[PDB]
Write a protein that binds this ligand. Structure first.
Ligand SMILES: Cc1ccc(C2(c3noc(CN(C)Cc4cccs4)n3)CCCC2)cc1
Length: 139
């Protein structure tokens, strides 16, 4: 069993530039984005998951049902759309983003007070780790 509900601050962000490059994000935006240390605010409500990734540049909000494919609008990220399914894999969330890019998806899990997020596309891997925090941030 796992519950992702909480507020989470970025601790480390490894290889994000190459991940965005593999999504063809242009270099001007990669410059802005690799400086960001976004927070995540997550509510897990049954199998209804809301993940709000919050930064000073752009936010990205996910709101989906685990196990249920949906049309994911990535306009503000890499100017694409995917048919995405996030599924349980034991206590991990395994996301497959079907679309133009091969091998696109991510895996999210918890280890103690760390939220782990591995993002993948075209064989390129970015790893982020967040720490659970308690001072709450108005947005
Ligand atoms: C050009 C550009 C690049 C990144 C981003 C953000 C970004 N940072 O990473 C990704 C890829 N994914 C959307 C992250 C996930 C959220 C939930 C599961 S995976 N976008 C920074 C914080 C949110 C948006 C916005 C815009």
């Amino acid at each position: 069993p796992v519950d992702f509900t909480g507020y989470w601050k970025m601790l480390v962000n490894e290889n994000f530039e190459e991940y965005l490059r593999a999504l063809d994000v242009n270099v001007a935006l990669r410059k802005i984005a690799n400086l960001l240390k976004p927070d995540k605010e997550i509510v897990q409500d049954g199998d209804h998951m809301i993940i709000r990734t919050l930064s000073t540049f752009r936010n990205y909000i996910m709101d989906f049902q685990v196990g249920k494919e949906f049309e994911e609008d990535l306009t503000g990220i890499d100017d694409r759309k995917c048919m995405t399914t996030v599924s349980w894999d034991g206590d991990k969330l395994q996301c497959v983003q079907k679309g133009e890019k091969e091998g696109r998806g991510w895996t999210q899990w918890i280890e103690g007070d760390e939220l782990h997020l591995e993002m993948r596309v075209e064989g390129v891997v970015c790893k982020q780790v967040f720490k659970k925090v308690q001072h709450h941030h108005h947005h």
